[PDB]
């Protein structure tokens, strides 16, 4: 008399969750990212992960997918100027 | 299979000029496929091929080289090409002049795996068992002073030298094949 | 494509081995004998006692003392090659 | 084949000390890893016969440090086979801002740094403290090379004049384009909460997560790290992850009041659920341990498949680091007790 | 037809420029360099073509072993001892365990005769004896299996000074020119080699009687500096050295392999996204830096993903040391299909018939 | 010996039922290696 | 479309050995002789 | 595998004549290339361990005439394994 | 493509084995022994 066990293996990949309304990929800038409710205010975020036990210290590695761009401009001979921007989190300094 | 046995190539028109023309290479007067010991560091790919030849070949085969090197697409690179048939190799051997106990040993007096193997023929086994003496160790806590040898190996392809100003393949009828400073006179050719 | 396997509708084509429908026979490289030796290293072995030469005045090689003072009197020694069975290797794998 | 390639890389807790031979007491040395002995009977010829299973013990051992690593084998052979090797490498440039920048006439200053730590610039298929063993590296010289298209002077001057207007600037963006966070998971723990204080969320794109071993993640920023004794493959840098199957579930919340998926767009509306234990509502799929919602979400996010019936995507849309390429389901039967 | 004008210049200018460094700073860990790039008048430089150039010396350490198994008597059985001698207390006697393969002509005081000089005037009948340094060697032996069981047998055996090791993986460097191992002792210099000779005759057969107990086996003994560079013992009978009879049975096994090599795609060789040491690219008129780097922008993984996205990855480029790392598919997921062993598989004896009988 | 040929006797024997049939082997190893199994399949729709 | 058609007789010769190894008593040891008898002096 | 597939194709100047056998004197006949003898110690197992390095002597030897030339053995087994063969070929037109 | 073989024109490119021109000698895996036993199972015997 026997019992059954099932499992799956999936390496060389990262788990993805998109911030889109229908989960599809309709462009670089998802429609929810432009929604007024998430754009003209502030909100707090809470996440809860449940994993399986292991017998050594480990790390949970999270990637917030954002926009990161740089613009480079050089008016006169021997001059380089740049402007960096990361939209959801930070951009240089102020004042 | 014998492409890898070239050293240098020199072109000369009218016995006064050199075809690469005005200074345009690391070695302006002539191309240089491979070379022996060179302290200036003109080699690439850990093999012993100079940068100039690698750049010329890449330009002539795939128009790659003025915007960085990267693997060409599969369809643009067929079986009789340069990149698919490029093999760099290297090894280490025992230096003699810097190792104290070097002793040249012929094949006659080499007993390794003795007592379970033939003797200079595929015949039956013979001999006692005894510690071995052929392969000098190159690893472990008791290695020996060693030197390095490097070579490159390429087959099933022809070296190419295109007749253009910037070596690119801009078309069938190359521009340098039209200029009346190179296409409205008579010239004689020497090569070495 | 059809080579790849999808494990949801059991989508996995059934193909034979191209080397079993058509047997491209070529023999097997067996230029060298593949021998098998004893476990100790020597099989047959005899028994021997040490001896030593004498002062050797002249034609005294016949005079020969026993060196039993130092060496034991039952040292073991083998003569000639060692015991060795033989098996052709690649032929058996191919035949199986 | 079985004994070597499996039984010599079992976890260290299943072995035992040898007899009448000296063994080093440092658990991170070649000597200790070499001297320990392992009973063959664990992985003999009769194990899991007929089943497409993987040893449960060896399901968390980093499989990219193994003497079958084609890339590692090729690189090691390429460098040499000796022990005292000269080397003549060439290094590219990786920063996204100036990787493809088209410079203009002038005179610029260009300065960079380099590492001399032995662990961080070498990789060993075994994984051992390379400071203790005694590897060494000595740089000798350094130079810089560059190549110019020999373009005609009129054309080059015209291009230079055009590329200096205040509207023909240049732009670049990092391909990954994300911000990273690392949270510690203490040994044997199972629940990890993360809180982010109020801020703006314009032009968000999504989340992407995985798991890592603390022993193989060098500390960020700090130039040196004397408490770092490991030289295997580092997933955090070259991207070789091997622990995505240990997650169980994820829950999201906004303003501590509303769950993000909100409307019932999932089978379990209030939370994603990757895999289930033995549970009989009949949800799992692909004859494996994964539910339906997660499968649908992954297929959508990777290939826009899921609203028209699943199928195998085309090769050109399915690269090496994708999802469907390396998704393996497996099952077996064992003796009830 | 290709374009003919306003593409390529005519004034002499280089295709490839090389810049030497201007400033170098060294430290225990970091190593910093600074150069002065100069894009000349009326040119355009594409940074995607630039690349650093480094060289030097590397010492991979004493735990490098790229080959599995060993390479010193691989075919030898895993427990066969070398021809050796050891001491034993009954006040102490020597025991020998060796093997003499070579067949000579006759044994005299000088040593095992091997050949003869030329049958010529003033040279006819001149015996030739073995050279003590290298002549009776462990390679030659009886040719065919119909051996005649010669009476003049010779060979070698390591004195009791050298410790005993299993034959599997045992190496000892040559000293003389003719590949004959033997320690060159310092005696009035390193000129002389110490090789002794020992004789043996049949016990039983020459016990009761004498017959001048002629000898039949000659063993030339030596002493070599042996060492096992890549194998280790897997069963050692007793903890102590000073080889005895028991130590004849120890067995060895090879060392696990390592593949220490430079990391794939040159990861870690340059500092990225670290405020401690940040790269600088700027205009020489005023040092306004143009490389602002945070501590969260992960560059290496991004470059890996990009290099996968824009091209193929299953090919190897040597120039950037670019070769992805992967595991064998079968190692991670076993597929136990047993084997295929319907037929037996036997090893017959050399002659063809083993035991025989007289008729 | 030395010829590329297929045995006459086995040309008319169905070569798709054989213990090297990759599809059969894969499906059987996917369902389990036992003798009593619970199964949880999903069947598509195939009419035109 | 056109292509020449040719037929005839070919004789590769006496030095044409497609298979490697041998094909007679393959498993036998490399030295074992057949059951044989010979003549000899006293 | 090493001994056969490499040592049988070493340059001729490294092989010595056998003993008590009749060997032809024309250096092109199959007999001369067959009855020569090459010492197996040249390319034994302990050769360039760990190094991905082609041999030195066997570098200018043509590697296409070799009994693992897949195309060649295919074209050989296409006609048959016998000795006398009727052949029925077709030939295309190659001029440009 | 050229790898595929067309019989009619006798079209079959000739190539050398990749592992014959360039030897990648990694040694061999021989951790375990490998023993040949006696047919009966017990070789020698006695009397009791
Ligand atoms: Ca006796």
mmCIF file with all atom_site columns, C-alpha atoms in Angstrom, chain E residues 151-309:
data_model
loop_
_atom_site.group_PDB
_atom_site.id
_atom_site.type_symbol
_atom_site.label_atom_id
_atom_site.label_alt_id
_atom_site.label_comp_id
_atom_site.label_asym_id
_atom_site.label_entity_id
_atom_site.label_seq_id
_atom_site.pdbx_PDB_ins_code
_atom_site.Cartn_x
_atom_site.Cartn_y
_atom_site.Cartn_z
_atom_site.occupancy
_atom_site.B_iso_or_equiv
_atom_site.pdbx_formal_charge
_atom_site.auth_seq_id
_atom_site.auth_comp_id
_atom_site.auth_asym_id
_atom_site.auth_atom_id
_atom_site.pdbx_PDB_model_num
ATOM 1   C CA . UNK E 1 151 ? 66.627 -19.619 -13.144 1.00 0.00 ? 151 UNK E CA 1
ATOM 2   C CA . UNK E 1 152 ? 68.306 -16.185 -13.279 1.00 0.00 ? 152 UNK E CA 1
ATOM 3   C CA . UNK E 1 153 ? 65.669 -13.765 -12.005 1.00 0.00 ? 153 UNK E CA 1
ATOM 4   C CA . UNK E 1 154 ? 66.295 -10.143 -11.058 1.00 0.00 ? 154 UNK E CA 1
ATOM 5   C CA . UNK E 1 155 ? 64.349 -7.066  -9.913  1.00 0.00 ? 155 UNK E CA 1
ATOM 6   C CA . UNK E 1 156 ? 64.027 -4.140  -7.463  1.00 0.00 ? 156 UNK E CA 1
ATOM 7   C CA . UNK E 1 157 ? 62.759 -3.410  -3.969  1.00 0.00 ? 157 UNK E CA 1
ATOM 8   C CA . UNK E 1 158 ? 62.633 -0.297  -1.820  1.00 0.00 ? 158 UNK E CA 1
ATOM 9   C CA . UNK E 1 159 ? 64.786 -0.468  1.344   1.00 0.00 ? 159 UNK E CA 1
ATOM 10  C CA . UNK E 1 160 ? 63.137 -0.141  4.741   1.00 0.00 ? 160 UNK E CA 1
ATOM 11  C CA . UNK E 1 161 ? 64.014 3.555   5.035   1.00 0.00 ? 161 UNK E CA 1
ATOM 12  C CA . UNK E 1 162 ? 61.233 4.669   2.689   1.00 0.00 ? 162 UNK E CA 1
ATOM 13  C CA . UNK E 1 163 ? 57.703 4.437   4.139   1.00 0.00 ? 163 UNK E CA 1
ATOM 14  C CA . UNK E 1 164 ? 55.243 2.173   2.357   1.00 0.00 ? 164 UNK E CA 1
ATOM 15  C CA . UNK E 1 165 ? 52.400 3.509   0.214   1.00 0.00 ? 165 UNK E CA 1
ATOM 16  C CA . UNK E 1 166 ? 49.865 1.734   -2.004  1.00 0.00 ? 166 UNK E CA 1
ATOM 17  C CA . UNK E 1 167 ? 50.892 1.530   -5.642  1.00 0.00 ? 167 UNK E CA 1
ATOM 18  C CA . UNK E 1 168 ? 47.779 3.445   -6.735  1.00 0.00 ? 168 UNK E CA 1
ATOM 19  C CA . UNK E 1 169 ? 48.979 7.027   -7.006  1.00 0.00 ? 169 UNK E CA 1
ATOM 20  C CA . UNK E 1 170 ? 52.640 6.921   -6.011  1.00 0.00 ? 170 UNK E CA 1
ATOM 21  C CA . UNK E 1 171 ? 55.198 9.104   -7.783  1.00 0.00 ? 171 UNK E CA 1
ATOM 22  C CA . UNK E 1 172 ? 58.914 9.716   -7.289  1.00 0.00 ? 172 UNK E CA 1
ATOM 23  C CA . UNK E 1 173 ? 60.935 12.065  -9.454  1.00 0.00 ? 173 UNK E CA 1
ATOM 24  C CA . UNK E 1 174 ? 63.837 10.787  -11.572 1.00 0.00 ? 174 UNK E CA 1
ATOM 25  C CA . UNK E 1 175 ? 67.378 11.691  -10.567 1.00 0.00 ? 175 UNK E CA 1
ATOM 26  C CA . UNK E 1 176 ? 69.806 10.270  -13.126 1.00 0.00 ? 176 UNK E CA 1
ATOM 27  C CA . UNK E 1 177 ? 69.574 10.981  -16.843 1.00 0.00 ? 177 UNK E CA 1
ATOM 28  C CA . UNK E 1 178 ? 68.312 7.485   -17.684 1.00 0.00 ? 178 UNK E CA 1
ATOM 29  C CA . UNK E 1 179 ? 65.119 7.695   -15.657 1.00 0.00 ? 179 UNK E CA 1
ATOM 30  C CA . UNK E 1 180 ? 66.408 5.568   -12.807 1.00 0.00 ? 180 UNK E CA 1
ATOM 31  C CA . UNK E 1 181 ? 65.043 6.682   -9.463  1.00 0.00 ? 181 UNK E CA 1
ATOM 32  C CA . UNK E 1 182 ? 67.455 6.715   -6.537  1.00 0.00 ? 182 UNK E CA 1
ATOM 33  C CA . UNK E 1 183 ? 68.499 9.140   -3.814  1.00 0.00 ? 183 UNK E CA 1
ATOM 34  C CA . UNK E 1 184 ? 71.872 10.787  -4.435  1.00 0.00 ? 184 UNK E CA 1
ATOM 35  C CA . UNK E 1 185 ? 73.403 10.787  -0.969  1.00 0.00 ? 185 UNK E CA 1
ATOM 36  C CA . UNK E 1 186 ? 75.972 13.375  0.080   1.00 0.00 ? 186 UNK E CA 1
ATOM 37  C CA . UNK E 1 187 ? 79.117 11.263  0.427   1.00 0.00 ? 187 UNK E CA 1
ATOM 38  C CA . UNK E 1 188 ? 82.300 13.151  -0.491  1.00 0.00 ? 188 UNK E CA 1
ATOM 39  C CA . UNK E 1 189 ? 79.670 15.049  -2.476  1.00 0.00 ? 189 UNK E CA 1
ATOM 40  C CA . UNK E 1 190 ? 76.535 14.101  -4.407  1.00 0.00 ? 190 UNK E CA 1
ATOM 41  C CA . UNK E 1 191 ? 78.632 12.072  -6.858  1.00 0.00 ? 191 UNK E CA 1
ATOM 42  C CA . UNK E 1 192 ? 77.697 8.560   -5.716  1.00 0.00 ? 192 UNK E CA 1
ATOM 43  C CA . UNK E 1 193 ? 74.394 6.682   -5.508  1.00 0.00 ? 193 UNK E CA 1
ATOM 44  C CA . UNK E 1 194 ? 73.802 4.061   -2.821  1.00 0.00 ? 194 UNK E CA 1
ATOM 45  C CA . UNK E 1 195 ? 72.285 0.913   -4.355  1.00 0.00 ? 195 UNK E CA 1
ATOM 46  C CA . UNK E 1 196 ? 72.719 -2.427  -2.599  1.00 0.00 ? 196 UNK E CA 1
ATOM 47  C CA . UNK E 1 197 ? 72.338 -5.983  -3.872  1.00 0.00 ? 197 UNK E CA 1
ATOM 48  C CA . UNK E 1 198 ? 70.672 -8.892  -2.081  1.00 0.00 ? 198 UNK E CA 1
ATOM 49  C CA . UNK E 1 199 ? 70.569 -12.577 -2.995  1.00 0.00 ? 199 UNK E CA 1
ATOM 50  C CA . UNK E 1 200 ? 68.013 -15.323 -2.456  1.00 0.00 ? 200 UNK E CA 1
ATOM 51  C CA . UNK E 1 201 ? 67.765 -19.068 -3.049  1.00 0.00 ? 201 UNK E CA 1
ATOM 52  C CA . UNK E 1 202 ? 65.063 -21.696 -2.592  1.00 0.00 ? 202 UNK E CA 1
ATOM 53  C CA . UNK E 1 203 ? 64.305 -22.553 0.979   1.00 0.00 ? 203 UNK E CA 1
ATOM 54  C CA . UNK E 1 204 ? 62.848 -25.993 1.049   1.00 0.00 ? 204 UNK E CA 1
ATOM 55  C CA . UNK E 1 205 ? 64.700 -27.079 -2.085  1.00 0.00 ? 205 UNK E CA 1
ATOM 56  C CA . UNK E 1 206 ? 67.942 -25.838 -0.591  1.00 0.00 ? 206 UNK E CA 1
ATOM 57  C CA . UNK E 1 207 ? 67.196 -26.419 3.066   1.00 0.00 ? 207 UNK E CA 1
ATOM 58  C CA . UNK E 1 208 ? 68.423 -29.857 4.109   1.00 0.00 ? 208 UNK E CA 1
ATOM 59  C CA . UNK E 1 209 ? 71.117 -29.913 1.445   1.00 0.00 ? 209 UNK E CA 1
ATOM 60  C CA . UNK E 1 210 ? 73.769 -27.425 0.446   1.00 0.00 ? 210 UNK E CA 1
ATOM 61  C CA . UNK E 1 211 ? 74.994 -27.613 -3.130  1.00 0.00 ? 211 UNK E CA 1
ATOM 62  C CA . UNK E 1 212 ? 76.673 -24.381 -2.406  1.00 0.00 ? 212 UNK E CA 1
ATOM 63  C CA . UNK E 1 213 ? 73.146 -23.028 -2.132  1.00 0.00 ? 213 UNK E CA 1
ATOM 64  C CA . UNK E 1 214 ? 73.614 -21.313 -5.477  1.00 0.00 ? 214 UNK E CA 1
ATOM 65  C CA . UNK E 1 215 ? 71.417 -18.200 -5.608  1.00 0.00 ? 215 UNK E CA 1
ATOM 66  C CA . UNK E 1 216 ? 68.557 -17.850 -8.071  1.00 0.00 ? 216 UNK E CA 1
ATOM 67  C CA . UNK E 1 217 ? 66.995 -14.441 -7.308  1.00 0.00 ? 217 UNK E CA 1
ATOM 68  C CA . UNK E 1 218 ? 68.873 -11.134 -7.183  1.00 0.00 ? 218 UNK E CA 1
ATOM 69  C CA . UNK E 1 219 ? 67.188 -7.978  -5.903  1.00 0.00 ? 219 UNK E CA 1
ATOM 70  C CA . UNK E 1 220 ? 68.792 -4.619  -6.384  1.00 0.00 ? 220 UNK E CA 1
ATOM 71  C CA . UNK E 1 221 ? 67.495 -2.350  -3.702  1.00 0.00 ? 221 UNK E CA 1
ATOM 72  C CA . UNK E 1 222 ? 67.297 1.420   -3.634  1.00 0.00 ? 222 UNK E CA 1
ATOM 73  C CA . UNK E 1 223 ? 65.720 4.336   -1.912  1.00 0.00 ? 223 UNK E CA 1
ATOM 74  C CA . UNK E 1 224 ? 63.516 6.879   -3.556  1.00 0.00 ? 224 UNK E CA 1
ATOM 75  C CA . UNK E 1 225 ? 61.863 10.036  -2.426  1.00 0.00 ? 225 UNK E CA 1
ATOM 76  C CA . UNK E 1 226 ? 58.297 9.006   -2.991  1.00 0.00 ? 226 UNK E CA 1
ATOM 77  C CA . UNK E 1 227 ? 55.210 11.153  -2.447  1.00 0.00 ? 227 UNK E CA 1
ATOM 78  C CA . UNK E 1 228 ? 51.492 10.940  -3.158  1.00 0.00 ? 228 UNK E CA 1
ATOM 79  C CA . UNK E 1 229 ? 50.431 14.316  -4.578  1.00 0.00 ? 229 UNK E CA 1
ATOM 80  C CA . UNK E 1 230 ? 46.717 13.812  -5.210  1.00 0.00 ? 230 UNK E CA 1
ATOM 81  C CA . UNK E 1 231 ? 45.515 10.641  -3.433  1.00 0.00 ? 231 UNK E CA 1
ATOM 82  C CA . UNK E 1 232 ? 44.705 9.893   0.183   1.00 0.00 ? 232 UNK E CA 1
ATOM 83  C CA . UNK E 1 233 ? 44.223 6.795   2.303   1.00 0.00 ? 233 UNK E CA 1
ATOM 84  C CA . UNK E 1 234 ? 40.711 5.459   2.854   1.00 0.00 ? 234 UNK E CA 1
ATOM 85  C CA . UNK E 1 235 ? 41.563 2.709   5.361   1.00 0.00 ? 235 UNK E CA 1
ATOM 86  C CA . UNK E 1 236 ? 44.612 2.972   7.615   1.00 0.00 ? 236 UNK E CA 1
ATOM 87  C CA . UNK E 1 237 ? 44.968 -0.083  9.891   1.00 0.00 ? 237 UNK E CA 1
ATOM 88  C CA . UNK E 1 238 ? 46.898 1.419   12.802  1.00 0.00 ? 238 UNK E CA 1
ATOM 89  C CA . UNK E 1 239 ? 47.455 5.059   13.711  1.00 0.00 ? 239 UNK E CA 1
ATOM 90  C CA . UNK E 1 240 ? 51.240 4.775   13.806  1.00 0.00 ? 240 UNK E CA 1
ATOM 91  C CA . UNK E 1 241 ? 53.988 4.942   11.194  1.00 0.00 ? 241 UNK E CA 1
ATOM 92  C CA . UNK E 1 242 ? 57.018 2.589   11.031  1.00 0.00 ? 242 UNK E CA 1
ATOM 93  C CA . UNK E 1 243 ? 55.564 0.154   8.505   1.00 0.00 ? 243 UNK E CA 1
ATOM 94  C CA . UNK E 1 244 ? 54.850 -3.367  9.752   1.00 0.00 ? 244 UNK E CA 1
ATOM 95  C CA . UNK E 1 245 ? 53.206 -6.375  8.111   1.00 0.00 ? 245 UNK E CA 1
ATOM 96  C CA . UNK E 1 246 ? 49.718 -4.956  8.700   1.00 0.00 ? 246 UNK E CA 1
ATOM 97  C CA . UNK E 1 247 ? 50.536 -1.701  6.898   1.00 0.00 ? 247 UNK E CA 1
ATOM 98  C CA . UNK E 1 248 ? 50.926 -3.799  3.745   1.00 0.00 ? 248 UNK E CA 1
ATOM 99  C CA . UNK E 1 249 ? 47.168 -3.672  3.278   1.00 0.00 ? 249 UNK E CA 1
ATOM 100 C CA . UNK E 1 250 ? 46.351 0.045   3.263   1.00 0.00 ? 250 UNK E CA 1
ATOM 101 C CA . UNK E 1 251 ? 44.333 1.378   0.327   1.00 0.00 ? 251 UNK E CA 1
ATOM 102 C CA . UNK E 1 252 ? 44.009 4.824   -1.238  1.00 0.00 ? 252 UNK E CA 1
ATOM 103 C CA . UNK E 1 253 ? 41.480 6.773   -3.289  1.00 0.00 ? 253 UNK E CA 1
ATOM 104 C CA . UNK E 1 254 ? 41.760 9.930   -5.411  1.00 0.00 ? 254 UNK E CA 1
ATOM 105 C CA . UNK E 1 255 ? 41.045 13.514  -4.403  1.00 0.00 ? 255 UNK E CA 1
ATOM 106 C CA . UNK E 1 256 ? 37.904 15.400  -5.359  1.00 0.00 ? 256 UNK E CA 1
ATOM 107 C CA . UNK E 1 257 ? 38.430 17.946  -8.154  1.00 0.00 ? 257 UNK E CA 1
ATOM 108 C CA . UNK E 1 258 ? 38.344 21.734  -8.101  1.00 0.00 ? 258 UNK E CA 1
ATOM 109 C CA . UNK E 1 259 ? 38.107 24.203  -10.976 1.00 0.00 ? 259 UNK E CA 1
ATOM 110 C CA . UNK E 1 260 ? 39.317 27.534  -9.581  1.00 0.00 ? 260 UNK E CA 1
ATOM 111 C CA . UNK E 1 261 ? 38.997 30.084  -12.385 1.00 0.00 ? 261 UNK E CA 1
ATOM 112 C CA . UNK E 1 262 ? 38.037 33.680  -13.106 1.00 0.00 ? 262 UNK E CA 1
ATOM 113 C CA . UNK E 1 263 ? 34.385 34.456  -12.529 1.00 0.00 ? 263 UNK E CA 1
ATOM 114 C CA . UNK E 1 264 ? 32.003 34.435  -15.470 1.00 0.00 ? 264 UNK E CA 1
ATOM 115 C CA . UNK E 1 265 ? 31.791 37.641  -17.509 1.00 0.00 ? 265 UNK E CA 1
ATOM 116 C CA . UNK E 1 266 ? 34.290 39.324  -15.153 1.00 0.00 ? 266 UNK E CA 1
ATOM 117 C CA . UNK E 1 267 ? 32.022 39.954  -12.186 1.00 0.00 ? 267 UNK E CA 1
ATOM 118 C CA . UNK E 1 268 ? 33.603 41.677  -9.205  1.00 0.00 ? 268 UNK E CA 1
ATOM 119 C CA . UNK E 1 269 ? 36.706 42.920  -11.009 1.00 0.00 ? 269 UNK E CA 1
ATOM 120 C CA . UNK E 1 270 ? 35.412 46.512  -10.934 1.00 0.00 ? 270 UNK E CA 1
ATOM 121 C CA . UNK E 1 271 ? 33.632 48.503  -8.250  1.00 0.00 ? 271 UNK E CA 1
ATOM 122 C CA . UNK E 1 272 ? 30.022 49.298  -9.100  1.00 0.00 ? 272 UNK E CA 1
ATOM 123 C CA . UNK E 1 273 ? 27.329 51.114  -7.103  1.00 0.00 ? 273 UNK E CA 1
ATOM 124 C CA . UNK E 1 274 ? 29.371 51.733  -3.971  1.00 0.00 ? 274 UNK E CA 1
ATOM 125 C CA . UNK E 1 275 ? 29.706 55.214  -2.492  1.00 0.00 ? 275 UNK E CA 1
ATOM 126 C CA . UNK E 1 276 ? 33.082 54.279  -1.016  1.00 0.00 ? 276 UNK E CA 1
ATOM 127 C CA . UNK E 1 277 ? 34.840 54.114  -4.392  1.00 0.00 ? 277 UNK E CA 1
ATOM 128 C CA . UNK E 1 278 ? 32.905 55.556  -7.332  1.00 0.00 ? 278 UNK E CA 1
ATOM 129 C CA . UNK E 1 279 ? 34.136 55.921  -10.889 1.00 0.00 ? 279 UNK E CA 1
ATOM 130 C CA . UNK E 1 280 ? 34.708 59.387  -12.323 1.00 0.00 ? 280 UNK E CA 1
ATOM 131 C CA . UNK E 1 281 ? 34.181 60.588  -15.890 1.00 0.00 ? 281 UNK E CA 1
ATOM 132 C CA . UNK E 1 282 ? 34.315 64.340  -16.279 1.00 0.00 ? 282 UNK E CA 1
ATOM 133 C CA . UNK E 1 283 ? 35.425 67.313  -18.334 1.00 0.00 ? 283 UNK E CA 1
ATOM 134 C CA . UNK E 1 284 ? 38.915 68.575  -17.608 1.00 0.00 ? 284 UNK E CA 1
ATOM 135 C CA . UNK E 1 285 ? 37.819 72.221  -17.665 1.00 0.00 ? 285 UNK E CA 1
ATOM 136 C CA . UNK E 1 286 ? 35.906 71.784  -14.395 1.00 0.00 ? 286 UNK E CA 1
ATOM 137 C CA . UNK E 1 287 ? 35.643 68.499  -12.524 1.00 0.00 ? 287 UNK E CA 1
ATOM 138 C CA . UNK E 1 288 ? 31.842 68.255  -12.564 1.00 0.00 ? 288 UNK E CA 1
ATOM 139 C CA . UNK E 1 289 ? 31.349 64.516  -12.199 1.00 0.00 ? 289 UNK E CA 1
ATOM 140 C CA . UNK E 1 290 ? 28.864 62.836  -14.532 1.00 0.00 ? 290 UNK E CA 1
ATOM 141 C CA . UNK E 1 291 ? 28.541 59.431  -12.827 1.00 0.00 ? 291 UNK E CA 1
ATOM 142 C CA . UNK E 1 292 ? 26.118 59.635  -9.899  1.00 0.00 ? 292 UNK E CA 1
ATOM 143 C CA . UNK E 1 293 ? 25.617 56.182  -8.412  1.00 0.00 ? 293 UNK E CA 1
ATOM 144 C CA . UNK E 1 294 ? 23.197 55.063  -5.715  1.00 0.00 ? 294 UNK E CA 1
ATOM 145 C CA . UNK E 1 295 ? 23.639 52.067  -3.408  1.00 0.00 ? 295 UNK E CA 1
ATOM 146 C CA . UNK E 1 296 ? 20.572 50.184  -4.683  1.00 0.00 ? 296 UNK E CA 1
ATOM 147 C CA . UNK E 1 297 ? 21.075 50.201  -8.456  1.00 0.00 ? 297 UNK E CA 1
ATOM 148 C CA . UNK E 1 298 ? 22.268 46.643  -9.114  1.00 0.00 ? 298 UNK E CA 1
ATOM 149 C CA . UNK E 1 299 ? 24.351 46.742  -12.285 1.00 0.00 ? 299 UNK E CA 1
ATOM 150 C CA . UNK E 1 300 ? 25.666 43.199  -12.703 1.00 0.00 ? 300 UNK E CA 1
ATOM 151 C CA . UNK E 1 301 ? 22.324 41.391  -12.762 1.00 0.00 ? 301 UNK E CA 1
ATOM 152 C CA . UNK E 1 302 ? 20.930 44.025  -15.127 1.00 0.00 ? 302 UNK E CA 1
ATOM 153 C CA . UNK E 1 303 ? 23.818 43.542  -17.543 1.00 0.00 ? 303 UNK E CA 1
ATOM 154 C CA . UNK E 1 304 ? 23.312 39.773  -17.380 1.00 0.00 ? 304 UNK E CA 1
ATOM 155 C CA . UNK E 1 305 ? 19.625 40.060  -18.228 1.00 0.00 ? 305 UNK E CA 1
ATOM 156 C CA . UNK E 1 306 ? 20.361 42.491  -21.067 1.00 0.00 ? 306 UNK E CA 1
ATOM 157 C CA . UNK E 1 307 ? 23.038 40.224  -22.530 1.00 0.00 ? 307 UNK E CA 1
ATOM 158 C CA . UNK E 1 308 ? 20.486 37.431  -22.523 1.00 0.00 ? 308 UNK E CA 1
ATOM 159 C CA . UNK E 1 309 ? 17.716 39.568  -24.007 1.00 0.00 ? 309 UNK E CA 1
#
